[PDB]
Design a protein around this ligand. Structure first.
Ligand SMILES: [Mg+2]
Ligand SMILES: [Zn+2]
Lengths: 152, 45, 108, 148, 289, 166, 297, 243
């Protein structure tokens, strides 16, 4: 029975799971693009949201500094996270880290996904664009909207 | 053959919120219309 | 445990040819507006995915060739370019990484 | 058994007993070897009784191929088209005579299961029985539990 | 290896039998087989019918014009001139027509002297069914005369078979006396009508119309239908019995699932009773005067 | 070893007459020695069965198995040989008529249990058969409604007659 | 123009159309090979070798895959709208379109024209034989409008009745039954002379043919056939008729201060099978299409 | 539990006769033609008997002298040989070769034609049926060039004789299923071709066998195909298409 409980187990326990999530977070901060199973990328995004929030809260704070030093095992990523990814989202709150699903892997056929931050100097992934506002259904909806607006 | 479909499939980026607001106003008006059942045609008590 | 007799071929057929074990026919396969290499709903196309992966790999190769050794991570943003294209005025403090091919039509 | 072999019905080929009776057997192709110890009965038959068998019924043609073989056989064709080929390997003259007589007396029907030995074309004479038989009719055919 | 030859021969024969059974070859006519003799078969066919046929008439009737055309085409496409036997074959057309006319008039005379209550259309349809292609083809196939008929096409179309049947009938008429051929065609045609229903060979459309016409020809007013018995009117398997009453008198009765088919069956029974062709009629006397 | 499936593409037919139908084409192709199981190949064949070639390719491209790509390549090369040699112009006017699986040559190895005993490791091999026929795919057999059952029951109740007498 | 039964007129119409199609297909000697190029986007640089006045763009799409035949409504030939069932002539380039495209306008116009023609065909056979009926024209209404209209002239004895919901339900059932059977939209570039000679009955059709042929010096109209019904429309249409998944006619409006006699104007809404919606949007579009809409000026 | 798979072979014919051996190969033909004949441009316009002579008739006289000296050589090597009845011999050889190809004959077609044109006439037709037949010949055949080589590789010489031919043929190529594909039924079409015959002179017997056929570049196009041919583009790999 696991009602209302998340925390998907991966490694041999909580410590190994946290270590793997920290490694994934460091890789996502460095390369800004990582393909991994859906649960791993979901947990990575969930932790990266709070990481970006804490980095945006401030720099001189000792709590955020200790958290960045703990969750980043490369040291050099801390100044980058504090001076690039923090001033970038100064106008956004919690709207970032877009998740996209890929098919399968050519090894064991496992469900994977790729996530990335907004902006991104790398070329954007092919987003599932919706239908244009010129199809029959869209034109009928626009006509009905204009009719109800002129009738009001 | 026929594939799976839903309601927000063939809609643009400026039609989904419009349809949501329209159906919300519609259900709110339908709920508000059935507020005074005694003044209509009630059955004998 | 040990069987007392032997299952027949009829029981084997009824067990292995049931619709529960047979593979279901999915109806989520469509086409793609770009390129078109048989994609699926809620799943990105493999062709454009491979293209953007190769492009990201080339950009990372160029970055590693420009950075040199490990343990760097610059404190400024980055911007990639292609053949020609002079840097704009709002891209002075960003690192310039130019390539050696024309600019694609899917990257603006 | 009957559940493993096909069956048929007992009927005439073209109603022989009604109008006139015709000979069902047509040709009799015999294969008697020239030298050997397995066709002595057939040789003696063709020597002594084949003329009498041909003169008994003019509607049966007898063919003697006289092919040097080892197993003497006989081909019997009928009007319906059935071809029954049997072997007279090491048989006496009386046995072969009885066999050819039985072949000439029979027709081209199969020797499978008879299935109902009696067969009639007009089974109903005084009206075929129906569930309404031996039941008197009421006034105006009024059904029970009615008012009119 | 296993030493032997007889078991191997039997196994090879079994393999050949299975091969010829799985892949049936096209059947060949009896004339092209080795064990075959035309004159012997003609004599056997002439002696098995308990009659007195002639060789010339049988050889003239057992051929066809298509056979002569094929023979002349084959002799002209190769170069061999055979005008000493081909020009004296004599087609079997006038003899076939004479035999057809004789069979038709004999059948009509028999149906008139046996069933006096048969109308013109009835006897016409009866003599057309008795002279139909199916019955004559069945008789010719059961008489083993298809193998003796000299014509093209191994299965033999029904037209050529009916033509050669009428030709041999005319030949028998020209050879022996008229009474012999009359008894022959009687015993070989009327025996097929045993056990068959009347309207199965007539196939009418509206039995009620012909019934009321025959009644008006018999100084009768008009028949009316009444429901005699019934069982189940609301179920999927209904049964009804409609009885035709003429001047408060029952004449016939016909069952059926509904009322329309029941009335149709009653009209058919009444029309068959008015013509005298019922199941309790006198059977045909197959004897000699 | 017997090979009679790859030789069916050489059966030459006589020239037809103008009063004869078009007659669809028959393309036979199969591979030998495939490292796979016969049960999974038969499952894939049952998944395919009588459908369009494009639909079969689409279903096999997203099928997470080992033999999916093998069957995809088989269908691709069969369609190529059909449009290049078997005189086929339309690439989407094909459908699989027959699709089954067989069994390949097997070897023997060891298993090594937890004592002096052991097992017989038999290298399971299989094949894959498929036939391509031109023209549109035939529609599936629709299920019979109550009218068909009623008519069949009426016919059965009407066909029964008197038995064990005359 | 004379007294004709409601059968022999369509008999002569369809046999004359068949004779015209036979003459058109026999006008060419042998089979001339053309080189049509594919300048689309999915598979660029593809050239096809087809026949002249025999090959159709549907057969060309069949050479690709089944998707190009299931998702295809109108073809682009040198910037001109071309349906999927029409023989080609000279060698040029072709481009396929769909509903879920960048600018779906020509496909929508063709779908609306096809739906109007189908409504006219299903309504011209749902009246009494004693009451003569006439078909005016099919005005090209924009996609922003509520529903397409089709003016139909009835008899002078029926100028005071209003069809209830039962007639609308019967018309929708007949439209669904007509959609159930697969009947292509066979078209042909028929000469205007023989086009007007085939009719010679309804003056409205003759006037429409004259107005549509007076715009081009070649005097060539665009005739279509749905199994056994001939109508005059503008531009190409849709290939198959099974594309319409939801078909339902709204109401009817009668205009009077424009002509002494009383004319009818029926409306209706339709949605393809590729762009099907839910029941809520369906009833919304059904209720919104019942209003009066006109775009003749 | 220790068995593998055998049967290790390849499906490719490599070189193995001349690898350390003392037995060569005695061929009966050569690779291609010696010299390509160039028909006149106005051949279709001047398809009658004769016309006016053109300017500078030295080249045609030199070609005639070369043909005459080649005929003299082949007569000195092997006497008793005519030239006037040679076109008729070539015509009947071509006719019987086409007939045996129509009747699906190989043991005779191998000796009727050479070892060069046999694959070109048996490859893309092995799984197909033909209904070829000769109806009538129009313009009589004539010889246009007589040449011979002197290759001293194995002491074998050949004499290719280019003899033009103009007649009417009836081609009917069906399919392996029985349906029509290429030509029509009985259609007396008009087409001309230049056929060359090669005979192994050094052979102790020697038979005039058809070498090959040369088609001029100004020849009219052939009849179109009854089906539709699809020409797809190259495989677009994950990159970019510039065309
Ligand atoms: Mg685990
Ligand atoms: Zn794509």
């Amino acid at each position: 029975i696991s009602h209302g409980r998340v925390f998907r187990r991966m490694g041999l326990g909580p410590e190994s799971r946290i270590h793997l999530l920290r490694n994934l977070l460091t890789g996502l901060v460095r390369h800004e693009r990582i393909e991994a199973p859906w649960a791993r990328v979901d947990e990575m995004r969930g932790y990266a949201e709070k990481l970006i929030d804490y980095g945006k809260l401030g720099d001189t704070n000792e709590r955020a500094m200790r958290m960045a030093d703990f969750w980043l095992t490369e040291k050099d990523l801390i100044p980058k996270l504090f001076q690039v990814l923090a001033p970038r989202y100064k106008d956004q709150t919690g709207g970032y880290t877009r998740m996209l699903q890929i098919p399968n892997r050519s090894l064991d056929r496992a469900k994977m996904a790729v996530i990335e931050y907004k902006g991104n100097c790398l070329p954007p992934l092919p987003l599932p664009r919706r239908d244009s506002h010129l199809t029959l259904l869209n034109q009928l909806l626009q006509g009905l909207r204009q009719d109800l607006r002129q009738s009001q | 053959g026929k594939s799976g479909t839903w309601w927000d499939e063939h809609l643009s980026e400026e039609n989904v919120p419009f349809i949501k607001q329209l159906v919300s106003d519609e259900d709110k008006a339908q709920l508000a219309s059935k507020l005074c059942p005694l003044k209509d045609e009630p059955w004998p008590i | 445990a040990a069987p007392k007799n032997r299952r027949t071929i009829e029981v084997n057929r009824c067990r292995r040819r049931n619709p529960q074990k047979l593979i279901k026919v999915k109806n989520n396969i469509d086409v793609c507006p770009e390129c078109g290499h048989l994609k699926q709903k809620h799943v990105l196309c493999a062709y454009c995915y491979e293209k953007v992966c190769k492009e990201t790999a080339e950009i990372r190769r160029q970055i590693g060739k420009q950075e040199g050794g490990p343990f760097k991570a610059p404190t400024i943003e980055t911007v990639v370019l292609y053949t020609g294209e002079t840097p704009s005025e709002q891209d002075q403090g960003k690192r310039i990484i130019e390539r050696d091919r024309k600019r694609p039509s899917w990257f603006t | 058994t009957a559940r493993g072999t096909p069956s048929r019905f007992l009927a005439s080929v073209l109603h022989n007993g009604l109008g006139r009776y015709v000979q069902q057997l047509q040709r009799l192709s015999f294969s008697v070897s020239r030298d050997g110890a397995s066709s002595r009965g057939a040789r003696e038959f063709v020597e002594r009784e084949v003329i009498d068998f041909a003169r008994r019924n003019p509607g049966v043609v007898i063919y003697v191929n006289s092919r040097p073989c080892c197993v003497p056989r006989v081909v019997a064709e009928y009007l319906n088209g059935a071809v029954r080929e049997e072997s007279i390997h090491c048989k006496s003259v009386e046995e072969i005579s009885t066999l050819v007589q039985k072949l000439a007396d029979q027709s081209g029907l199969d020797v499978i299961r008879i299935r109902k030995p009696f067969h009639t074309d007009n089974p109903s004479i005084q009206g075929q029985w129906h569930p309404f038989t031996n039941k008197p009719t009421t006034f105006r055919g009024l059904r029970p539990r009615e008012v009119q | 290896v296993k030493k032997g030859f007889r078991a191997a021969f039997r196994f090879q024969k079994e393999l050949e039998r299975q091969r010829l059974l799985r892949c049936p070859p096209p059947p060949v006519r009896r004339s092209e087989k080795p064990n075959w003799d035309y004159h012997a078969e003609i004599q056997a066919f002439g002696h098995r019918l308990q009659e007195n046929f002639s060789l010339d008439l049988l050889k003239t009737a057992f051929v066809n014009s298509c056979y002569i055309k094929s023979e002349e085409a084959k002799r002209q496409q190769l170069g061999i001139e055979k005008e000493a036997v081909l020009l004296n074959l004599k087609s079997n057309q006038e003899l076939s027509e004479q035999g057809t006319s004789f069979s038709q008039t004999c059948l009509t005379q028999f149906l008139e002297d046996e069933y006096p209550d048969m109308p013109t259309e009835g006897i016409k349809n009866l003599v057309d069914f008795l002279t139909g292609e199916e019955v004559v083809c069945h008789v010719a196939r059961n008489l083993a005369v298809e193998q003796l008929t000299l014509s093209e096409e191994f299965p033999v179309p029904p037209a050529v078979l009916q033509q050669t049947f009428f030709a041999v009938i005319g030949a028998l008429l020209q050879s022996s006396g008229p009474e012999r051929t009359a008894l022959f065609i009687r015993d070989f045609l009327i025996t097929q009508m045993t056990g068959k229903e009347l309207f199965e060979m007539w196939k009418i459309i509206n039995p009620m119309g012909l019934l009321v016409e025959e009644l008006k020809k018999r100084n009768v007013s008009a028949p009316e239908s009444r429901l005699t018995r019934q069982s189940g009117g609301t179920t999927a398997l209904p049964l009804y019995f409609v009885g035709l009453y003429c001047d408060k008198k029952l004449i016939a009765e016909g069952p059926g699932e509904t009322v329309l088919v029941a009335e149709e069956e009653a009209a058919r029974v009444a029309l068959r009773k008015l013509y005298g062709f019922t199941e309790n009629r006198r059977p045909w006397n197959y004897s000699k005067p | 070893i017997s090979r009679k499936w790859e030789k069916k593409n050489k059966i030459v037919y006589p020239p037809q007459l103008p009063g004869e139908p078009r007659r669809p084409a028959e393309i036979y192709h199969c591979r030998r020695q495939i490292k796979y199981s016969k049960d999974k190949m038969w499952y894939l064949a049952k998944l395919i069965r009588g459908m369009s070639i494009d639909q079969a390719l689409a279903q096999l491209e997203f099928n997470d198995k080992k033999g999916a790509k093998i069957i995809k390549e088989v269908l691709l090369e069969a369609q190529d040989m059909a449009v290049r040699d078997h005189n086929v112009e339309f690439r989407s006017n094909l459908y699989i008529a027959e699709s089954t699986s067989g069994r390949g040559q097997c070897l023997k190895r060891i298993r090594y249990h937890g004592r002096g005993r052991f097992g017989i490791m038999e290298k399971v091999y299989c094949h894959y058969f498929v036939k391509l026929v031109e023209g549109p795919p035939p529609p599936p057999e629709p299920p019979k409604t109550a009218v068909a059952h009623a008519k069949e029951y009426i016919q059965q109740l009407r066909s029964r007659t008197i038995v064990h007498t005359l | 123009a004379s007294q004709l039964s409601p059968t022999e007129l369509t008999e002569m119409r369809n046999d004359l159309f068949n004779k015209e199609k036979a003459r058109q297909l026999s006008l060419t000697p042998r089979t001339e090979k053309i080189e049509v190029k594919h300048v689309g986007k999915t598979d660029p640089g593809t050239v096809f070798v087809m026949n002249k006045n025999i090959s159709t763009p549907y057969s060309c799409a069949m050479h690709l895959s089944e998707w190009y035949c299931r998702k295809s409504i109108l073809a682009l030939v040198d910037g001109q709208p071309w349906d999927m069932y029409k023989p080609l002539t000279k060698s040029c380039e072709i481009k396929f379109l769909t509903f879920k495209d960048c600018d779906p306008g020509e496909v929508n116009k063709a779908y609306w024209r096809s739906c109007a023609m189908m409504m006219g065909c299903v309504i011209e056979r749902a009246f009494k034989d004693e009451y003569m009926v006439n078909l005016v024209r099919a005005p090209e209404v924009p996609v922003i409008s509520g529903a397409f209209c089709y003016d139909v002239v009835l008899d002078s004895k029926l100028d005071e009745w209003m069809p209830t919901k039962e007639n609308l339900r019967s018309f929708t059932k007949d439209a669904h039954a007509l959609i159930y059977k697969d009947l292509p939209f066979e078209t042909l570039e028929v000469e205007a002379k023989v086009a007007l000679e085939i009719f010679q009955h309804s003056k409205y059709k003759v006037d429409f043919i004259e107005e549509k042929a007076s715009q081009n010096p070649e005097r060539i109209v665009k005739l279509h056939r749905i199994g056994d019904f001939i109508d005059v429309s503008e531009g190409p249409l849709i290939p198959r008729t099974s594309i319409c998944f939801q078909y339902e006619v709204s109401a009817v409006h009668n205009l009077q201060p424009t002509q002494p006699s009383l004319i009818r104007r029926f409306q209706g809404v339709s949605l393809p099978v590729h762009l099907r919606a839910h029941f809520t949007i369906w009833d919304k579009l059904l209720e919104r299409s019942r209003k009066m809409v006109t775009e003749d000026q | 539990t220790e068995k593998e798979f055998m049967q290790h072979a390849r499906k490719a014919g490599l070189v193995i006769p001349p690898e350390k051996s003392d037995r060569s190969i005695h061929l009966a033909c050569t690779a291609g033609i010696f010299d390509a004949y160039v028909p006149p441009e106005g051949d279709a316009r001047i398809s009658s008997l004769s016309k006016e002579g053109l300017i500078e008739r030295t080249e045609r006289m030199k070609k005639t002298m070369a043909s005459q000296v080649s005929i003299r050589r082949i007569k000195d090597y092997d006497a008793n040989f005519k030239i006037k009845d040679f076109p008729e011999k070539a015509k009947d050889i071509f006719i019987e070769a086409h007939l045996c190809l129509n009747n699906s004959d190989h043991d005779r077609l191998h000796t009727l034609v050479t070892e060069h044109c046999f694959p070109d006439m048996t490859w893309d037709i092995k799984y197909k049926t033909v209904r070829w037949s000769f109806v009538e010949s129009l313009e009589p055949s004539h010889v246009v060039q007589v040449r011979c080589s002197s290759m001293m590789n194995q002491g074998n010489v050949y004499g290719q004789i280019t003899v033009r031919m103009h007649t009417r043929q009836t081609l009917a190529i069906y399919d392996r299923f029985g349906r029509l594909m290429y030509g029509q039924e009985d259609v007396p079409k008009d087409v001309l071709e230049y056929v060359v015959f090669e005979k192994q002179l050094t052979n102790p017997y020697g038979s005039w066998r058809m070498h090959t056929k040369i088609v001029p570049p100004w020849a009219p196009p052939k009849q179109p195909i009854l089906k539709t041919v699809m020409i797809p583009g190259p495989q677009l790999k994950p990159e970019e298409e510039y065309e």
